[PDB]
Every structure is written in C-alpha cells, then in structure tokens.
Paper text:
[name] is a large, 374 kDa member of a broadly conserved family of HUWE1 factors (also called Mule, Lasu, Ureb1, Arf-BP1, HectH9/E3^Histone^, Ptr1, Upl1, or Eel-1;). This family is characterized by a large N-terminal domain attached to a smaller C-terminal HECT domain (Homologous to E6-AP Carboxyl Terminus) that provides ubiquitin ligase activity ([Fig fig1]). [name] has been implicated in the turnover of excess levels of small, basic proteins including ribosomal components and histones. We determined cryo-EM structures of [name] to reveal a helical repeat solenoid architecture for the 2,888 residues preceding the C-terminal HECT domain and an overall architecture that resembles the published structures of HUWE1 but with a larger fraction of ordered residues.
We performed single-particle cryo-EM reconstructions of two [name] constructs: full-length [name] that contained a 20-residue tag including 12 histidines inserted between residues K1074-D1075 ([name]^[name]^; physiologically active in all phenotype assays) and [name]^ΔAD^ with the C-terminal Protein A described for intact [name] above ([Fig fig2], presumably inactive). These structures were determined at resolutions of 3.97 Å ([name]^[name]^) and 3.07 Å ([name]^ΔAD^) for the dominant closed ring conformations ([Fig fig6], 7C, S6). The two maps and structural models were very similar to each other, indicating that neither the internal affinity tag, the absence of the acidic domain, or the presence of a C-terminal Protein A scar induced notable conformational changes. As expected, the acidic domain was disordered in the [name]^[name]^ structure. The structure of [name]^[name]^ is very similar, with the exception of more poorly resolved density at the UBM domain. The Neck is followed by the Body domain (residues 507-2,888), which comprises a helical repeat solenoid structure that forms a ring architecture and leads into the C-terminal HECT domain. The first helix of the HECT domain, residues 2889-2906, helps to close the ring by packing between the HECT N- and C-lobes on one side and the Head and Neck domains on the other side. The Head domain largely closes one side of the ring formed by the Body domain to create a basket-shaped structure, while the HECT domain is positioned to one side at the opposite, open face of the basket. Mutation of two residues in the Head domain at the solenoid closure interface reduced human HUWE1 E3-ligase activity, suggesting that the closed conformation is important for the catalytic cycle.
Author numbering: 2 to 213, 236 to 1074, 1076 to 1532, 1539 to 1872, 2220 to 2276, 2450 to 2574
Write the structure that this text describes.
Amino acid sequence: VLFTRCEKARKEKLAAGYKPLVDYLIDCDTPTFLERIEAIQEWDRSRDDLYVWIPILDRMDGLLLKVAEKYKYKQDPKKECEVKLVEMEAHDVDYCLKMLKFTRRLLLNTENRFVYSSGDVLMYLLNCPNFTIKLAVMRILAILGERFVIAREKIVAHNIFGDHNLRKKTLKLALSLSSSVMDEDGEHFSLVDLYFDKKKVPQKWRKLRFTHIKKVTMTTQELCEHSLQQIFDKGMALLPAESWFDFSIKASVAKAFSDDSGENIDLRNIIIETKLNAIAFVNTIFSPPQVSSKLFELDPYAFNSLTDLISLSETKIPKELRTDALFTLECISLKHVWCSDIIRNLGGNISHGLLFQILRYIAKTLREATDEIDEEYNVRFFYLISNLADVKPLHESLFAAGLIPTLLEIVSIRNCPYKRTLASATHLLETFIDNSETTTEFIENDGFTMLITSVANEIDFTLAHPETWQPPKYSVVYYSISFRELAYIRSLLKLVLKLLSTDSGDRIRNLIDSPILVSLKKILENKLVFGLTLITYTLDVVQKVINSEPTIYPVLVEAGLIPYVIDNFPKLIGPSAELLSLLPDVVSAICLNPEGLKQVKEKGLINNLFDFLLDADHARILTGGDRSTEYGTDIDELARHYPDLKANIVEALCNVIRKMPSTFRNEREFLFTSPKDQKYFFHRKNEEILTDKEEHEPAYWELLDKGTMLDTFTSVLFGMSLGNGSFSQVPQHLEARDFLAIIFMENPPYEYFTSVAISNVTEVLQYLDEKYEDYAFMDVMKVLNDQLENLNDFLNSPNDRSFFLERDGENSVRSCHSKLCRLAAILNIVTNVYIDLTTLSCKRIMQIYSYFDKRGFSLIKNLKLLFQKCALEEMYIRQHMPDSVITETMPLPIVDVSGDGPPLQIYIDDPKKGDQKGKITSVKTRNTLQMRTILYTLQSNTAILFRCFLRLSHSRNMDLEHKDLTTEVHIFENVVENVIEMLKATELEGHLPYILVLLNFNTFVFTIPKASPNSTEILQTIPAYIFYQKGGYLLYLHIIRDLFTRMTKIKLSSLDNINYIDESNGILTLSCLINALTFYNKSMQTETMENVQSIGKYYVSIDDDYNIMKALTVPIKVMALAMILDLDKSDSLFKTQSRNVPYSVFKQLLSMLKNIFTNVNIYTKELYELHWDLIFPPIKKISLFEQVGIPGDVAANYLTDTGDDLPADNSIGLFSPEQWEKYKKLIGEDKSIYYPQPMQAQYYKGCSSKELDELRDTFFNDGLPSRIFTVLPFYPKLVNAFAKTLLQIFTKYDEPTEVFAGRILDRILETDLDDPATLSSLIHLFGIFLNEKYIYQKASHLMQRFIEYLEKSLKPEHVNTPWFSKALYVYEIILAKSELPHLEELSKDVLLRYPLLSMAKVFRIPDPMKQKLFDILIRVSDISNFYSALATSRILIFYSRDELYANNIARSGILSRLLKVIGSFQKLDKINFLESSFLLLTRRCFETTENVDALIRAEINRSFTARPAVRELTTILEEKAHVVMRSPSQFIDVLCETARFHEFDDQGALVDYSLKRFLGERDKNTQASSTEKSDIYERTGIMHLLLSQLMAASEKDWLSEPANSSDLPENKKAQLDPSRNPVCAYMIFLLKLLVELVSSYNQCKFEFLTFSRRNTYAERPRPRTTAINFFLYRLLDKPVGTDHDKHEAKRREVIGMLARSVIIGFLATVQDDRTTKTDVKLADPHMNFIRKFAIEAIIKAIRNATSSSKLLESNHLKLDMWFRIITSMVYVQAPYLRQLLDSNKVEADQYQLCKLVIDLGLPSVITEAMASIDLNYPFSKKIFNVAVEALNTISSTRNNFSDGIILKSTVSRWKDIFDMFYDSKTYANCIIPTVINRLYKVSLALQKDLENKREQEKLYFAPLIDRAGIASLMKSVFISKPYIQREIYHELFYRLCSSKQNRNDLMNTFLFILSEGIIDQHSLEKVYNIISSRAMGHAKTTTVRQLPSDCTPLTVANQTIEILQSLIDADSRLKYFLIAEHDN
C-alpha cells in the first residue's frame, strides 16, 4: 500500500532494478506474456519483492478480472443472486490457472507479500462450480493464509477476512466427504485404502442425496444419465438460490463415485487435495477454541489418516497430495495446540518410529541419488522439525531416542550434486543446537573436524571448474558464479561461526591443525568471483578469534592472511550494510600489537576508514536508520582504548568536510508552470481548475543525491557527538568559518527546514556551544545580516499589491523564492539553537550587547519590513483563489502545531471538519501549498525573535550598568518605535485581517511568553512605558471608536453561541474588540504587570519616584473614561431598549469600571520620562562638554562626588585656556530640556491625577448608580457581574450599602408578580448582595420582610416557573446560616484563661413560621423544572435533622415523583448532583436514633484509642465535620460522660485544649426495647417503591446501544462505557441504592424480605420468596447472543456483577457498636432465621434443572453464576463490597456461614448436584470447574475447630452533606463553649480534687462427604484436561483427607482403577460405569454410561499417576498404608 517517507526512496531506487525484466514482459503482447511466464519455474537468485512485479500483478488482475465479469461471477454485498450453476469453460482453464500458477511460485520464494492488493478479486473467482480452478484458487488462498499467520496478520478484514460470505463458503468446501467412515463390516476404511487392492468403497457414499426444507436423493446408476452440468441445472431449480453451494459440493462427489473412469480417481484426488487445503486455511483463520468442535467435532477422524500419507516412497499416493499434506501440518504446528498430538500420531518419542526413519531413507537416497530425488518436499521437513522444537517440552523427547546422530549422516556426504538440501539441514542443526547439552553430543560424534574439512574441499573445488558458475541474469550482483553454492558455503560458515563461541580454546586448536587458514585467503584473493557477503563472515571469523586468543597473532602473520588485508584495505569496501558497520572493530584488531599499531599510524589506514561517505551509494544503505549512529559510537571506542590514534582520526574529519562543498549541484527544480495561462498562481476567486492524481505534496529532499549524503554524514557526526571523544578538537584544527559552509546550501527546496539533518545538527551545535562559547555566534549573525541585505527587490516594494502575483509567469519568480527557502532554514536553525529564552547565560547576552554596539541597529528595520510584507503577502492569494481550495492547501498540519503563536486564524471550516486533505489537488495547489508554507513558519519565528532580546537582564536580573545598561534602553527604544509605524499605516477599510493579525502580534510580543504555572501574563513594564510616553494606547483608542460604530450600526443578531472564526463580516468586525479591550485592561490591572521599580538610582536629577507601575496606571485610567462618557451621552448604552451590543463587550467594559475605580495608593503631580540618551552622567556630556581633554574620570568625578547638575561649560576654574572660545557653540540643548519629557500632551485635559477625583463624580451621578433597573431587564445573563461593579463603586465612597438592598426590595414588591421578568433576576441580585460577609449584620429587618413576603402568595403550585430556584436559594442561605449549632454562652466562673475570641451573630428564624413553610413546601405535582427539583431536594434535606419531619417525608409521596423526575431528565450533566443529593436524602430517611448513638460512640471511642493529652480539641473538632452536625445534642450527651478531661492547670483555669484519653473513670449506661423495635416501623413504602421501579425498568430492553454515536471509534480515552442507554444508568443507580441500603441499615432487610405486588398488610404478614427468586431467576432473562458484541458482553457482566453484589450483601452483617472487642461466637437470633431462608432459596434451585435433563440444558447459564454465589458467600467478599463491612466482625461470619452450611450438608448437596452431569456435553468442564473450589473453600475455613464505579460507607456519606453546604471547617466554635458547661466543671474539678488531693496524702476429621459422592468425585480425572487446573484438584484431595472414614476408601478406589482398569480399551469402561454406579446408587451397572470419545488408557494413567505422586508428596502417614496387608 504505502510506506514511511524514507523507505519510499529505497523502494524507488530498487524499482530501477529488474528494469529489463519488467520491460521484458510489460512491453509484450499477451500471448507472449503467457509464454514468458512458462519459463521461470526455478529461481537462481535471492528473493525478489512483489513491489517490482506490482505492474505484473495489475496486468494479471486486468487480464482475469474481465473473465470474472464474463460469467458474472463477480458477487456483491448488496445483490445476492450468487451465480447460475455453470462451470467455467474448459479452454480458459489453463489461461485462468496458468497466471494463478505463477502466482504461487512468486509468493513462495518472494518476500513482503503484505503489499499484495488484488486478493479481493479471488472471491469473485470463487463461486466456480468447476473444481480444478477451485483447487488452484484455494491453493493461492492457502498461501495467502500463510501470509496471514506466517508470523502475525489479522488485519485488513474487509479485504477477505471480514467478508462473511467466505468463511461459510470455505467451511462448506471442507467437511465434504469428511474422512474415513465406520462401515459395519470394516474397522474404519482408511482413505489410504482407496489405492490398495483391499477393502472396497463404503457404497453408502455411492448415492445422490441432499436435504435441508427440501430433500432429494438418487442411488448410483441413476447418475449415469445427467452430466455434472445437467445434474446442477436439474437440481438448482427446486432449491433456493441462496442454496446450491452444498449441492455443488456433493453432486460432483456423487458423480465421481458413480463410476470408475480413469479421470475419476483424478477427481477424487482433486477433491481430497482441496479438502486438506481448506482445513489448512480454516485453522489459519479460525481460533483453536472454535475449531475444537466447529470442524473437528463433525470430522473426528482427521489427524489419523493424515500422517498416513507423509512417510516416503509409497508409490501409490500422489506426490502432489503428499506435498499438500506436508503443507497443512506446517500450518497447524504454528501454534502450541496440536503439536503433541502430531508427535504422537507420528512417533517422535521412540526411536525407529516415523520421524527418525524417513531421515534414514533420505540419507539412503542422497548416497546414491539417481532417481526420484525431490527437495522442495524435503526442505519443508527440516522446516517442520524445527517448528516442533520451539515447544520446549516437546523436543527433549526428540534429543533422546537419537536425532543428532541421524542428521549428522545426512551431512558429510561428498561429491553431492544436490547441495540445496544440505543448506537447510545445516540451518536446522544451527537452530536445534542451543544448550550446553546437545553441543557435547554433537562433538563426541566428530562433527567438528567435519565442517572444517568439508568447507576446504568446497572452496578448492569452487575455483576448479569454470564451466560451473552460472550466475543470475536479471539483477545487481557481486558474485557472478551461482547462488546455491554461495548459500551452501554461507550456511557452513554460519554454523562454524556459531560453534566458535562456546569454549574457543579447543576449537581454535582444532582449527589450526587443518587446511583452512590457507584456504580462507583464497576468498579475499578475488571477490569478483565470490560475492560480497562472504567477506563479511570471513572477516568476522578473523576478528573474533584474534580477540579470543591474544597469543595467536604470529601464526596468523605468516600464511599471507594479514599482510594481504592491510595492503588492500581500499580494495574490499562495498555497498553492504553489515560490512560497512564492521570496519571499526576489525581495525581494532589488526592493531593489537605494536607492529600493527605503527603500520596503522602509517600506510594511510585511518584516512580510508572515513571518506566513501562522499558517494551517495555508500552513505545511503546506512541511511541513518539507527544503523549509521552505530558507526559513530564504534569509532569513539577505537580511540577510546588507543590514545596514540587520537591525532590521526581528527585529520580525516577535517579533510572530508573541506571537500564536501564541492559537489552540491543544483539538480531538480523549485516549482512548475501551470499547464495553461503560464502562471504559477491563481487570479480569481471563481475559476476552473484541473486535477491530477499523486501525493498531495511533492515530498522532496529525497532521491536528490545530496539530501541523502547530508542525512548520513550528519547522523554519523551526531553519533560520534555522544559522550566525549576527539570531536572536542575539531574546533581547534578547524575554524567556525568553514563549518557553516556545509549547512545552508545554495538552493534548498521548501521543506528543507523540516528534516533530521537540521534536527541532528541542532543537537551537535549545542554541544560545541556548550564548551566553546565565542566560536559560532558572530559569524552566524553576520550570515543572517548579509542574507537579509541581499534581499531588496520585494522587501521595499509598494505595500498595496501582490508582489509575487505582480510578476507571475516569468523566470524571475524562481529567483525570488529561492532565497526565501534559505532564509527560512536560517531562521529555523537560529531561533532554536542560539536565540531562545530558555537558554540565557549572563555571559551570553553580553554577545548581543557587543554585537549591536560595534555594528548598530541595521537588521531591525529589515526584520520589521519582512514581518510587514509577509502577513500582507499572505492575503491577496486568499483574495484571488477559489477559497474552497484554501482548506486543501491549509499549511498548518505539520510538525510544531503549537497554535500558541501569532499568525494563523482564517479557518473556513470547523476545527473538527476531519482531514479533507488530498481530496483535490493539481499543479496550482502545489505551488500555493509551498508559497504559504514558508510564510507561516517565517512569521512564527519572527515573533519569538522579537521577544527574545526584549527581556535581557530582567529575565535573569543580571544588574547591568554603564556601557552595558546604557545600550539596553537604546535597544528597547529602537525596538518599540519600529512596530508602531506598521500600525500607523495600513488604514482600516479594505484590509481588516491585517489589523487583527497585527493586534494579535502586539498582544503576543508585548506579553511575556507562557510563564508561571497558571499566571497567563505579566505585562512588560518598561516596554509599556516606552509605548505610552512615546505615544501609546492612543493608536488603539481611535480604532476602538471606529469599530464600535462599525458594529452598533450593523443591520437583533444571534451571536450568543458562536465559534470557528471565519470571514463572515460580522465576526471579524467584532473579533478585534475583544483583543483590544483585553490588552487595554491588562495595563490597568495591578497584578498583570511586572515589578520593575526604578527611577531610584535611575534618574536622580528630580524629586519623587512616579514608579513606572503605580504611576503608569494613572494616565491610562484618566484615558478611556472620556470615551465611556461620550458613548453614554450618545444613544449607545446605559439607555434605550433592547440589546444592541455583543454579549461579551459588557463583561469587558464592566471589568474596566471595576478597574477604573480601583485606587491602590497614589496621588501624582508630574511624571518624567526615561530618556537614557541623557542618563546619570549623560552621553551628551562626552559628546560636547567633556570632549576637549576627554575628562572622562574628572568630569564624572566632579559630577558625582560634587554637585550632580551639569552647569554647562565655562572658564571659571580648572579649565583649559582653549575650553572657552571653543565651547561657544550652542543655542539651546540639554539645559532646560535636560530633563526628559515630563508631559507633552494628553487626550482631553490633564493626565497625572486630579482629572480623576473630578471625572468620577460626573459618571457617579449620571448612569448605573441610579439607572441599572432600566438596563438590567435587557441583560439578565451577566447579572452575576453587575453587582461586582456596584460594590466596587460604593466601596471607596460613603457607606449606604444596605440602603441599596432596601431600595431593591421596595422595588421587588412592586414587581407585579404576574410578570416572570424582573423578579427572577432581581431575587438573584438580592441573594448575591446578601451572600457578602460584611453586608449581613445590619440587614435583619430586611430578611424578615422577605420571609413575610415569601410566606403568603407562595401558592405551592408555584414550582413550574423560573422564579422558584433563586428564591429557594436565598432561603437556603438564610436557613443554613440560621440553624447552626444553636448559640450557647457559658457562665458560673468559666475561668476563660485567655478567653475565646467569641463568635459573630446570626438570625434564628421564628419557630412557627418554619412549620408553615414545610406545610407549604411538601406538596407538589407534575414537577418538570429540573432546577426547581434540584432546589427542592436541597431545601428538604436540611429539615431531616429532626425525626417526625422524616416520618412525614416518608409518608408524603414526594419521593414517589421526585424519583421518576430522575428518568424524566437523563441526558444533562448535573444529573450527577441530582442523584447524589437524592441518595443522601434517601439514606437519611431510615436513619433512626438507635443507629446514630451506636455509630457516634464507635467514632469517638476509636478517636481516643489510636496513635497516629492526645487528640487536641482544636484539631479533632475540626475533623469532626461529618460528625456533630448530624445531631449535636446526641454527640454532646454521648461525649459528656467520658474522656475525663485532664490538664486542670496550676490555677485551675485551662491553658490547654487536648483532653485526656478514653475515659479514665468510665461510666455505666443501659438502653433496650429497640432490640425488638430495630425492625418494624410498619414498612415505610420506600423499599417497595424502589423494588417496583426496578421491576418496571427490568423489561426496558437494556441491551440496545444508542441509535448512533457518531465518531465513537474516533474517541479520546476509551470506548465501551456502560453509560448511555439511559436505562443502564437508571438500573445502575437503583442497584447502588439497594446494595448500599440493605447492607447498611438493619431494618431495611425486613422490607426486602416481605416483598409483594399488592403491599399486603398486618403484622409480620408472612416471609415471602418473590425477591430472592427474582434476583436469581428472573433477572438476566434477556435472550441475547447475536454474534460478538463487546457492548452486550460488558453490559451483561457489569449488571451481573452488581446482582451478585446485592445478593451477597443481603446476608452480610450490618456494622454497629460491636467494634473494638474480641468476640467468641454467637448466632443472630433474627438474622439467622433470615440466613436459613436465604440458603434454603439456593438449594431448591440446585435440585431443579438438575433432574429432567431438558431442564439441565437451558439452565447452565444460571448454573454458571449460581455455584459462584456460594463461593462468594463462604468468602466474606464481593466484587465491590470491600469497605462497607466491619472487618474485625467478620470472624463469626465465616463460623456461622460454615456451620449452617454444614447442617444442611451443602457439600453433600453439591456432590449430588455435581453427579448426573453427563460428561459428553460441552459445558461439562465448565460446570465441573466452578464447584471444585467451592468444596475447597468450605474445607479450608473448616480447618478451624478449636469498571470505574465508586461506593462509600455510612460515616463517609455524612462528609459529603457537611461539605456540600457551609464549608468553613471551624464551626465547632459554635459548640466549643457548650461542651465547657460539663467539659471541666465536674471533670477537672471533681475527679482531680477527689483523686489528686487524697493521692498526695499517701504519696475434627469428621466425615465431610458420603461414600457414594467421593466415588462420584472420581468421575473427575477422565476428561482431556490441560494443566494448571490440576492444582486445585490436588489441594482439594490433600485437604479432603484426614477423614478417616474416607481416607481408607479414597485410595481404595484408585488402586482398583489401576490394577483392573488400564489394560486395554474394553477395560476402562467397565470401571467408569462402576464408579458411576457408585454415584447414582442403584443396582449394579443396570445401564451403560458411554465414554466421552476420548481418554485412552494412557491419558487416564497419566492423570492418575500425577495425582498419586501429588498425594504421596504430602501425607507422612500415607506411605505406611501404601505398603501393608489390607487385612481385608
């Protein structure tokens, strides 16, 4: 299909290869093409990728696709007529298959078959009644399936995999004639008998037959009339069109069986061949678990009779059939499923079997090798035998019995003219020999000293006969002899190479004493006749041995090997990957002794090591694909361990670099010209465009012959750059000048600025800069300046036309763009590497200072001009092109997509449009695609460049001065003014987008880059001062006014909801306004400004400081108030009707007012200017005054050490005689203007204070402060903000404050309630006003009047109107603040001792009024206002602190509708809050005084007993949030008489808070009469309501996912969420409710027990069973299973898990005061009665569906889960329920839930349930698995006789209620005094005096199951079981012992099964039945139980002996019984 960028270059280069061959076929007529194909049977070269044949593939597809449509065989996913039963014509058979025939040959020996694409056409070639074509098609399909799972491929499902009209087709093709049969008078009639002269065909098959519901059949001799075509034609008519496929399958089979024609046997061969191929494909695609019975079950006699064909010779079987059978097993053995079975069927565990015998036969064949010598069949063998050996435990049984000594005789043959196999056999031996074990056996058979004597003969014979050497004919080669011999020698060399690395010493010695060393040289002698790979292995052999042996060199010195290598180094290298990456170590060896080292220093070795990178071919192969960097890393190693070579290496780098500039030739092009109009761009928005078909982008920088060189060389340099090395010296020998030369070529194309090379050098130059600072900075900046200056044509052209589109169509265009790409590259490199804020050094910016000082400000103007022209340039193209295309050529989608960065916002399609790329493109697009691409990056870089030197010291606070600082301000100024001139020009009308871009740029540069964690921006201060004082904000002020009128005049508009900035005149017309006002505000804010406090020690010639932040704030504030007032005077705002303003501009202006009245602390008279030019001792002094005599020190000395006020120059004292008569040159300068500009001019009048404090009053008494009520009706949304401005206004001035709220309310009553317009927002205004702290105290009279108003006229029907939520919100505030812990104050000599600080006041509402509200509140109906219900729940929850109110809530019916309101709205977000509040309310209901006391006592007692004087009161009380507020009185009472407060203090007045530990004296308390009253409460209908709602929701089709989810596969985090399908969340919510309530509150169970559908009455009506049954039986009744759907599975699993959770929690024990104790054991008198009912429900379900086999077929699903609940019950553990239970209380739980289970004998129950489970059923294993652990769980505990769902607990749920409302975690102060009334009064007085005073005066092997069950348990260990499972059986059997009554019988069962059972086939059954008869005790073998078609005695014995070993490995006492006399 397509590959990554770099690989495409290699593919294209290789495409040149096979140029003659590809042309040799394509440029030919089709008849020749077929004749050409029938010549390439064999392949004499290496593997050739399909990509080169791609055109051949397409030609074949076209050639045959026509035939496919000729017969309409082309099927469709829409049309389903299939095909008429006509088989493809005889003549075309060869034509159709021959082309396919070659396809198999190609696909076999080729590589990377992935890119094959014509696969889908094969299905269209399916549906072919003829078989031969079918056989070939399925054969190609088999090879393709190999491709699918050769290693791993299950992708491109739509191609052939997903298509479901193929899986069934191939399955039907399989299972046709199946395998051998069960004929009566015959064992099996193995298919192989078809050819022997013995048992005849099973005539049964010789009869036509077919039925579904149709049916047809005809006996043989009835098919002799109709032909195949006639048979098919007659049949089709009756049966459906969708049918006839099986008819085609079986009719031809019957016809073949109908006679004995000579071709008939060929037909049978064809059909069987197709069958094995189909089996291969089926196993290829289908998973083992399915095929286990999907196909194998239908045909069980498959593996048998398969190995019957692959042995050898057997001159009856078709060799083709043999090969096909070989192939299938190769596919099967890929996985670890059928391996062992294959071995057993073959016999690869005992010698003289099959495997180890056909090898003997092959050895016999090769020894003579004169007939029937096949090798394609042989290689597959060694392949397979390697395939088995991967499965580690399946080749130990191959090493044993003798394998190596059988292959070893296949090798060692001499004069073999069949050297093909030996390569594969050697490869197999290499693969097999891995461990330390087999190596020893190999040698001891004298294999070593066989290869090193075969290779010598091979090599010497190689040069003997030139009549050999028939090399390739269509390829690029380096050997030119013959491929096979090369492969053979390569394999032998590989094997020796591997074996050289075990012990060495022996191998080296054996190597010396042999004619191999002299033979090896012959290879290097002439590579023109051997090839290039061989030298790789030869040199590796040489390199490792010398390293292995240091003292072996001299022997190598002679024989001519080494001297030949050194004197020929530049005679071996070539374009091979491994070879090139192998040089560094080889030279690391030749220099292991001083002679070699000296020769290397001489002889020019190193120099040749480098170089060869200047030719494209050599540097390509490495391609820097992580291969090249290895070269660099290695090179350092050589120098790393050889210091003497340090010098020479660097010289190589220096020389190579200097030569590289040479080639660098302009090669291809920049752009193209349009096919018409001869223009490079467009002219009109409307125009016609042609289209082409290729990559949407050109993708240059590759195939250029220079980019590859740059990539490779830069990669090598980067690799060597790592760590350290000689690279640190290249700067020494070289100079920075030339280094730059290699980068920044003359003519780079557009994309050059995006490649690894630039990125790679981006890292290298950092390293050099990190050490050698003053190396490559000034020269780089010089190059930048020179390149900028070299551009003058368009850089100064007029700024009102398209320069590029002004000279289009002429060659001058290329010249223009050329330099642009180079400039882009230069900027890209410079911004990243040198100029960037992240990299700032105190020694760095000094370079900038010195550079600008010595050069000046020259590039600044050029940069500004470039920025102006660029943006301006990128508009006319937009304004003259078919805009639709603008999205096609959109440039942004390239690396560095950080939209943060000024220049791009014109999107003409929504951001989520998609890709929409490459939809339409042509030559015009490509030119435009580039022309814009450069400009974006150029502009982006320019802005960062502008910022970088706009911070200087302030970034690091370097504290400059003198020359350093002096320039700083000059850079600032020469930076600020430049940008203004851009804005001054470029008038508004005509070009708006430029205005937006420029404003964005200003906001960009003037704003500090993203800094701080969240602080968006700290506005630059000194730049702001320069901007203003030079004239700033007055440029915007005019733009603001123009646009303001430009918008208000617009034709009500709907702008509230908008996004996706576009060219709709409106949005642009306003888009500026947000940008402008935002920036304007940023200045005024006292926080979004950096502190640059100066003037002090900056301008010391004046008074005051006029701090540049606080003072600068003033003039801006003075400004813009005039425009506010002017607009107000006009009919603009704060007047009129309707809204004529954008929604956000109010938010903006409103914030300004808050700022405009934000006085911080300042009053100003005058401000002075920072005019560095005259700074401290100025520059003008040296310019003129202290010029003669240059008194630099003296003049400065006088100025500083004495009066610092330049008095000018005269000749009064200490002056030269010539000073006067020469100084007389001046009129006026720096005398009165010496002080910088104090104030030049302003906007209206004055700007330094005192314009404020007089302009405020005009507005203060003009508009909103008395006119909001008129405007507010027209702007309700922002009411949130209106108050803020009013509060700010009223802050500074006098304090009417609450008078405003009073005037409000006086307007509220007059609201004329009927109107839902003013009241709705007005109450919210009041509330937000009331929320404020300081305005609370003096508002009591207002709150009561509000209460009185609310009481009457409320009309509880008033719930369906907007003016309800906010009213209840204000009431919520009032109430919550009201009913705090009631106010309490202490007395009676409290002994304050630093008394408490006291607390503020509150307003406790009157008692009776609340009663009315509640009586007016709890009555509603048909609520449908979401927010209203949200408010109702919130208000109601607070009253539940009482009890009788809770009773009324229960018996109110409000919940009965508030619940269904949940289902009314489920797609909204805040349903979360709604459900949380409702759950808290419901949980609060059942709460009763009984539970509260126990839970509180548990909480406090735990606190004063743990250990993280303890428990500081001021800390615990703050963490008792969820506590106390529930019932402060009860918390006091329980905590009163305990904790015995200590620390009475010396005087008795407390000086501490922490109390004493748990009560030191304790107390006695009692309480009862609730033990029987814990339940009852007459069943408040809550539980019935919830259960009924769940029952209703159950049958609501909670399986179908929502109709559509749009781009669900384009999600963000994870799909398959259980949410959506609102019912699921609804049911999830209800299950949460139940699983919390039932386990939490005790009384809830009774209701869950006494369910019904009619709410029957009377005391304890009757314990029913309609709820447990529902949770077990009814739920999960949905019939589903429509194929595979993860959504369905996930939903089912979640709901089932929750169901199990609830049922398990049913029986759990509720947490209570039973904590922090020991427990022994007790039975809950009530719960226990519930326990038995719970279990009793389960046991009945077991008996049912067990008997009545039919009821045992449709109940396993229920049964599956069922047994699991028992496990999860005996375990006190549930999927989610882990933190809702009392852990220390789980002791008795297991005890009781084991004893009760034993009473009914559930173990005894299960085994009976386990019995009767027939093994033949597929679920057999499944259901056996679940129970076995259950018994183990029961026994294990018995040893003691002596997705993202969140759930919480009781104490935890209170915290949510505490924090949702009032949050301040200090309200305990409301009760802190209260506890004091008894905290110490009688605690630290009575106990202390009574104690302290007087103290100082004196100072079972029980039967666990039955005798017929364990026998039934022995029904185990018979099914064909895998490993791991056996573990649990061992644990059970070992633990099940100690039952003395069973220990005797347990084993006695087995020994019998051994002695009598495993003797033959007809013995096992006669004990399997007996053990069965011992399970369902009745008679003795009154009926036969069939065996499960498996379990041969070997398997039973295997499992049985395994288990026997297991048992005897555990029981110290078992051995004794093992050896004895039974005593009968």
